[PDB]
C-alpha cells in the first residue's frame, strides 16, 4: 500500500554514536547579577531564621473574603479627578446662580485616626518594600481593638482609587445599607488575625533549607530508621 522507497532512520542518541540535541538550561545559563540577586532574595526568607514580626506577614486572607472586601470597597470609591473639576464648576455655577463619607489612605492620615478611634477595618499589603511602616501597626491595633487584614497586591490596592500605590487603607465611615456585610467581615477578620496574636508572638518560623539538603538529611534519617529496625534484632 505505502511506498517502500521511504526508509525509517532511527538516530540513536548515544555517547559516541550521535550528536546530542539541546535542552532547557535555565539553571545552566549564566544569569546576570541583578537577576541572581533578586531570585536569591526570595530564597533568603526561607533559609534564614524568621522572627515573628516578619512571620506575621505570612498569614494571608483567602480568596472569597478578599473578593467580598473588594466588592464592598467598590461601592464607596471616590470620584474621578475630572469629576472633581466638574463638581467645582457646578459649585461655581451654583454660586453664580456636605461631603459624602469616603475611604482614607496613607499611614500619616490612618494612624492618627487609629488613636482617635474612627476607623473600623484596616487593609495592609503583604510585600511592601518600606517594611518599617507596617510593623508597629498590628501590635497597636491589637491593643486598640481594630481589625486588620493582609491582602494580596499593593499595586491593585492602590489602583482602586485614582492613585498608583497605597500602603494602608482605613474604613472610616459606612452607611446603614452596607453595615451587616461589613460587620460579618469585621467578625471574620477578628477571628482570623486578632484572636490568635498570643500565638503569633510565640510562633517562630523560617529555617527551611534547600530540597537537596532536606533529601540528603532524610536519606540518612531513613537509613538509620531502617538500620535500627534490624540492628539489635
Amino acid at each position: 500500500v505505502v511506498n517502500p522507497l521511504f526508509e525509517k532512520r532511527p538516530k540513536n542518541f548515544g555517547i559516541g554514536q550521535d550528536i546530542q540535541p539541546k535542552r532547557d538550561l535555565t539553571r545552566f545559563v549564566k544569569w546576570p547579577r541583578y537577576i541572581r540577586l533578586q531570585r536569591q532574595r526570595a530564597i533568603l526568607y526561607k533559609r534564614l531564621k524568621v522572627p515573628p514580626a516578619i512571620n506575621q506577614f505570612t498569614q494571608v486572607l483567602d480568596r472569597q473574603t478578599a473578593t467580598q472586601l473588594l466588592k464592598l470597597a467598590h461601592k464607596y470609591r471616590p470620584e474621578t479627578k475630572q469629576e472633581k473639576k466638574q463638581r467645582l464648576l457646578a459649585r461655581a455655577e451654583k454660586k453664580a446662580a456636605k461631603r459624602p463619607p469616603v475611604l482614607r489612605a496613607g499611614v500619616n492620615t490612618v494612624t492618627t485616626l487609629v488613636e482617635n478611634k474612627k476607623a473600623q477595618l484596616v487593609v495592609i499589603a503583604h510585600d511592601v518594600d518600606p517594611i518599617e511602616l507596617v510593623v508597629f501597626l498590628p501590635a497597636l491595633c491589637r491593643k486598640m481593638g481594630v481589625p486588620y487584614c493582609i491582602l494580596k497586591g499593593k499595586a491593585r490596592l492602590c489602583r482602586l482609587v485614582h492613585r498608583k500605590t497605597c500602603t494602608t487603607v482605613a474604613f472610616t465611615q459606612v452607611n446603614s445599607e452596607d453595615k451587616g456585610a461589613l460587620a460579618k467581615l469585621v467578625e471574620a477578620i477578628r477571628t482570623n488575625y486578632n484572636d490568635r496574636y498570643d500565638e503569633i508572638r510565640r510562633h517562630w518560623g523560617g529555617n527551611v533549607l534547600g530540597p537537596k539538603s532536606v533529601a540528603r538529611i532524610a536519606k540518612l534519617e531513613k537509613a538509620k530508621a531502617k538500620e535500627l529496625a534490624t540492628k539489635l534484632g
Partner: protein, 118 residues
C-alpha cells in the same frame, strides 16, 4: 522556547535618531573656496613656455587644498576645455605646481593667446 546558549546574550533593545525641534546653528557655511580663487596664476617662464610648446602642457599654481580631479573640474567649469591628465608637485617655497595635459584639438599656445598671456 528553550535556553539554547549558556551565555546570556543582550538582545537588540532600542536606539533612535535625531528628530529635533530646531537646528543648532542658524546660518550654514557656504562655498568659500571659489573656482576663481582655487586657480591662482600660470607661470610665465621661458623654459616653461618651451615645455608648453614641446609637450603641449600647461603649468598652473594651484592651492594646496585642491585635488587632481578638482583642478580638472575647475578648469572645465571656467575655460570649458577638456583635460587629459593632471600631474602636481609642491615647490620648496610652499606652492603647488600642476601639469595639465591638454588635448591636441585645442592648442596651448592658442588658448594662451586667447586669454592674453605670452
Amino acid at each position: 522556547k528553550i535556553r539554547t546558549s549558556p551565555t546570556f546574550r543582550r538582545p537588540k533593545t532600542l536606539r533612535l535618531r535625531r528628530q529635533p525641534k530646531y537646528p543648532r546653528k542658524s546660518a550654514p557655511r557656504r562655498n568659500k573656496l571659489d573656482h576663481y580663487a582655487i586657480i591662482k596664476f600660470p607661470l610665465t617662464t621661458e623654459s616653461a613656455m618651451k615645455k608648453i610648446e614641446d609637450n603641449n602642457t600647461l603649468v598652473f599654481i594651484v592651492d594646496v587644498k585642491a585635488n587632481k580631479h578638482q583642478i580638472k573640474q575647475a578648469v572645465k567649469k571656467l575655460y570649458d576645455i577638456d583635460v587629459a591628465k593632471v600631474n602636481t608637485l609642491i615647490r620648496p617655497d610652499g606652492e603647488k605646481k600642476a601639469y595639465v595635459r591638454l588635448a591636441p584639438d585645442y592648442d596651448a599656445l592658442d588658448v594662451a593667446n586667447k586669454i592674453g598671456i605670452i
